[PDB]
């Protein structure tokens, strides 16, 4: 598949510095959907502003977790069936913390923003399409965690 190669090559750029890039992803996410901020409750306390989240070690560890799951999807781009049961359970976990299924479209747009800004002119419409399809497949598997 030509799409598989566009994903592996663009990911190579991002995965060199995962926290710096995941920081961009989450900064964009809170700019688009501020109501996601209170869902990160560590020690039963809420962040007041988005910049508060960037000083939290637990929050930064969640950024690392996110980037590792994407890395697993990229590594298995030819065979995403192998990640399916793990992703369903990851969906169930997020449902339990209070994430709505609709918020996964915002996450997808923030991922595309982070790729666009990192790759610049190397972010071609073919690259955008490849990532949209991969992200779509990941979301389909996770959405099984919301009962169906
Ligand atoms: C709407 C955006 C999201 C919110 C509000 C959110 C919130 C959380 C919270 C509160 C936890 C538990 C505390 C913690 O482990 O830090 C968590 C766990 C986790 N999240 Fe997220 N998350 C979001 C998106 C994602 C995405 C897109 C991925 C990966 C693709 C991801 C991967 C994980 C992983 C791997 C865990 C640990 C699950 C476990 O094994 O218990 N999360 N999420």
Specify the overall morphology: globular
CATH topology: Globin-like
Estimated share of beta-strand residues: under 5%
CATH-defined superfamily = Globins
What is the string of SSEs from the N terminus onward? HHHHHHH
Going by helix content, strand content and strand pairing, the class is mainly alpha
Determine the N-to-C terminus distance. 29 Å
**Portion of residues within helices:** 55-70%
Number of strands: 0
Q: Which molecules are bound besides the chains?
A: protoporphyrin IX containing FE
Q: Just name the CATH architecture.
A: Orthogonal Bundle
Provide the number of structural domains: 1
Q: Rg from C-alpha positions?
A: 15 Å
CATH C-level label? Mainly Alpha
Largest sheet: none
Q: DSSP helix count?
A: 7
Pfam family, one: Globin
Domain Globin: 1-147
Binding site for heme b: 62, 94
Catalytic activity: Fe(III)-heme b-[protein] + nitric oxide + H2O = Fe(II)-heme b-[protein] + nitrite + 2 H(+)
Describe this structure in words.
The protein is mostly helical and 148 residues long. The chain has a single domain (1-148), classed as Globins (Globin-like). The protein has helices at 2-15, 18-32, 50-53, 57-75, 84-97, 103-119, 125-143. The site of protoporphyrin IX containing FE has 16 residues, from α4, α5 and α6. The PDB classes it as oxygen storage/transport protein. Keywords: Globin, OXYGEN STORAGE-TRANSPORT PROTEIN complex. It forms a monomeric assembly. The entry is titled "MURINE NEUROGLOBIN UNDER 30 BAR PRESSURE NITROUS Oxide". The protein is Neuroglobin. The organism is Mus musculus.
């Amino acid at each position: 598949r030509p799409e598989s190669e566009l994903i592996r090559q663009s990911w190579r750029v991002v995965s060199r510095s995962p926290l710096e890039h995941g920081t961009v992803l989450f900064a964009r996410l809170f700019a688009l959907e501020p109501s996601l901020l209170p869902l990160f409750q560590y020690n039963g306390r809420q962040f007041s502003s988005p910049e508060d989240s960037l000083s939290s070690p637990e929050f930064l560890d969640h950024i690392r977790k996110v980037m590792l799951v994407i890395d697993a999807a990229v590594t298995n781009v030819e065979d995403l069936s192998s990640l399916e049961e793990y992703l369903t359970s990851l969906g169930r976990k997020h449902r339990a913390v209070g994430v709505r299924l609709s918020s996964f479209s915002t996450v997808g747009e923030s991922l595309l923003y982070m790729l666009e800004k990192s790759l610049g002119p190397d972010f071609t419409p073919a690259t955008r399409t490849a990532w949209s399809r991969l992200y779509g497949a990941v979301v389909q598997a996770m959405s099984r965690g919301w009962d169906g």
